[PDB]
Amino acid sequence: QIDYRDVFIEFLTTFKGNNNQNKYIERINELVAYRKKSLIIEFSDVLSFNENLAYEIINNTKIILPILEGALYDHILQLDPTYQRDIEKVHVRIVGIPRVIELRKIRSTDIGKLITIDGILVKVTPVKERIYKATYKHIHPDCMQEFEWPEDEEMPEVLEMPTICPKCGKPGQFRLIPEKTKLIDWQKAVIQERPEEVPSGQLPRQLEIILEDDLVDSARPGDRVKVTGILDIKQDSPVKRGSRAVFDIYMKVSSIEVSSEEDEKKIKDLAKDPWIRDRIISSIAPSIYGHWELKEALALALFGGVPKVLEDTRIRGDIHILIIGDPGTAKSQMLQFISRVAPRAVYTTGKGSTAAGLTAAVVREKGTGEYYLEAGALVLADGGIAVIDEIDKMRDEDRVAIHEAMEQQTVSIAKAGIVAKLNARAAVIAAGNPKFGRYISERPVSDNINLPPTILSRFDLIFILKDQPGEQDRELANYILDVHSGKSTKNIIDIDTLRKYIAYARKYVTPKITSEAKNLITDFFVEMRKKSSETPDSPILITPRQLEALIRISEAYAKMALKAEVTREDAERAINIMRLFLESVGVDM
Amino acid sequence: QIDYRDVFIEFLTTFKGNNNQNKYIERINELVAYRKKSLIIEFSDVLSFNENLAYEIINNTKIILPILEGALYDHILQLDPTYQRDIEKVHVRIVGIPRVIELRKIRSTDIGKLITIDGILVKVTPVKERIYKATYKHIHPDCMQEFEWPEDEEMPEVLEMPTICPKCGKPGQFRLIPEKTKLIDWQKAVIQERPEE
DNA sequence: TTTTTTTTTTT
Ligand SMILES: [Mg+2]
Ligand SMILES: [Zn+2]
Ligand SMILES: [Zn+2]
């Protein structure tokens, strides 16, 4: 009854934020400056301003939304006439709806209402074009007339062809005219419920969502997203008569969120502590006793180095870690922790993986007999971390796919007439067991791990974990029993804060190596080479590839402390950890 | 509105090249020598010579492109009558269009406009033939009439058969006549975006 | 092509 365009338009112009900044008028600025055509409004903000407007949006969404959009378009038109003849429609998207429903609990009562669903994006289709207003021509020697068939409304999800010519009243043949047809961008994606919500003994459920207009290509597969929109039943084969009055539901997306100022302030405060590096290492797997050297290396892989593009070649910034340990050394517990704290990580197992599943799988569209690719584990981990457990138990045919990923950071696909090269810039963390149960110290690493030597050289660091009973058993027993009793360590950064810290560092920090750091690295290398030249009788090689590892590790240390330069201390720490690896593989100074 | 046919002809004949050599005339003569039927021009030269002509090419390419080809064809046959009886339609192609769009960034607003794309060829089909003007015969014991169904219009990409015989005004059965059907060479290729982008 | 269990030939 009461028009809400009046209260809405002044709400945009008059609203004060946390720091008294008038965000919405600032947000509306680049909408006309950069021609966004889409606006984002928080539900809490509109609720505090006027609850009557807020509750009308949730309930009567299908009616108030077109009215609100028209008011905003007029506001932009008077503010900048140049928007005309450029963008003819502006979308306003509402986020933060309190009505959040689990994927498994959707029932018929929620159809046609604005709801929010949290899940994981698993599938994305290429962008396509959908007709919303067609133009046909009547093929009848008398007629030769053109008209817009879905008059006075929009073309439904099912393409319907006119049967009677509206301009002559006769049936016959109608020809589509693509020149005068109105199109709109259209994309389809599949969302899956999070593994924490799946009930015992059940399999995860999936829901189909539709992204249109500017919402296309707003997310990548494997991302955790929050999506808001309207549910509706799906019609796909109306001509398929015969039983089956049962339909599936699909979601019509109106707004999507992936995964901000106070957090940035909180991150900066943490970096001010001189011992921030020690705190971060102590926060890696707090439930595991000992393994300080391994924890330090795992922290470095989370941050990584800085990739370098030379005149001809490319230098990867990712760090690869290989862990060999006796059974029961808590190898899998840390890998589970790493996959949970990293902003983007994929956890795989040697036995549960295949070559097609790791890189890309060809799917034949039975409906049209068409071939298209599906992203594999390594591709989904691009820009993140790939964790592989029990690498020694993987099939040899499935292991060769990893060889290209670690070396060239690329995956080559040539099958079913599809040729492409895919980026796989991901850090690889692998764990394995020795050949004969426990580890034999006297024998070299190569004959004690059951892996080809060609893959050993591709790892920046290798660690050996030995479960030798001794005087530390009492401390380990006391620590474990405390964990089972609920006792937790203090001064530990929680997972959520730690994940945000890593994401910020990987995005805004690019350390640069100073001259002093370069001299120390060069001096250590040449003196090591001279020492190694006397007797290079070790299974672990000392090739110049180790020099790149030293560069990467030093950059990671600087990035951990949010430093813009690599100083003497960072280079010294990188040498120490590199020296331990060069001597813990069974070869002495 | 303004007939650019005269402007196009003088532009070709009076184009100041790197040394005012009128290279467009040189390639026109080369085209006549080997019967190439395809003339390529640079958008920068057109814009420098007459920016108004350049805008019309880049904006109304659906309408004015056949007009320019007709003007060029008349000039060629006037220059050399022997070009006739060999090529009935010359081709003019534009290069260096400033409107460059990334492949992933294509949206609905770019449909029906002249754009350029950079990529990698992956698949190429063998050369085939496409019908653009078919000839049909009405199989109705009183008709025995032949006609070209797509009257005053090029045959669309969808092969459609007439429903009413235009010559006799009756429905029925129609048979295609390959011997009186116009054909054009047709090939399909697939372009893939570069891995860098 | 792809994963799977099966009998079969052939990589
Ligand atoms: Mg394990
Ligand atoms: Zn009609
Ligand atoms: Zn007839």
UniProtKB/Swiss-Prot annotation, chain A:
It catalyses: ATP + H2O = ADP + phosphate + H(+). Its EC number is 3.6.4.12. Changing residue 545 to A: Loss of helicase and ATPase activity. It comes from the Archaea. The keyword Hydrolase applies. Residues 276-480 form the MCM domain. Gene3D superfamilies: 2.20.28.10, mini-chromosome maintenance (MCM) complex, chain A, domain 1, Nucleic acid-binding proteins, P-loop containing nucleotide triphosphate hydrolases, Winged helix-like DNA-binding domain superfamily/Winged helix DNA-binding domain. Pfam families: MCM, MCM_C, MCM_lid, MCM_N, MCM_OB. One of its GO terms (biological process) is DNA replication. Inhibited by the cdc6-2 protein. The ATPase activity is not stimulated in the presence of DNA molecules. Changing residue 344 to A: Loss of helicase and reduction of ATPase activity. Changing residue 316 to A: Loss of helicase and ATPase activity. InterPro entries: AAA+_ATPase (IPR003593), MCM (IPR031327), MCM_C (IPR048908), MCM_dom (IPR001208), MCM_lid (IPR041562), MCM_N (IPR027925), MCM_OB (IPR033762), NA-bd_OB-fold (IPR012340). Transmembrane segments: none annotated. SMART domains: AAA, MCM. GO terms for molecular function: ATP binding; ATP hydrolysis activity; helicase activity; identical protein binding; single-stranded DNA binding. GO terms for cellular component: MCM complex. Keywords: ATP-binding, DNA replication, DNA-binding, Helicase, Hydrolase, Nucleotide-binding. ATP binds at residues 325-332. Changing residue 314 to A: Impairs helicase activity. A motif (Arginine finger) lies at residues 457-460. Belongs to the MCM family. Homohexamers. Forms a complex with SSB. Presumptive replicative helicase. Has ATPase and DNA helicase activities. The latter preferentially melts 5'-tailed oligonucleotides and is stimulated by the SSB protein (single-stranded DNA binding protein). The active ATPase sites in the MCM ring are formed through the interaction surfaces of two neighboring subunits such that a critical structure of a conserved arginine finger motif is provided in trans relative to the ATP-binding site of the Walker A box of the adjacent subunit. This is Minichromosome maintenance protein MCM. It comes from Saccharolobus solfataricus (strain ATCC 35092 / DSM 1617 / JCM 11322 / P2) (Sulfolobus solfataricus).
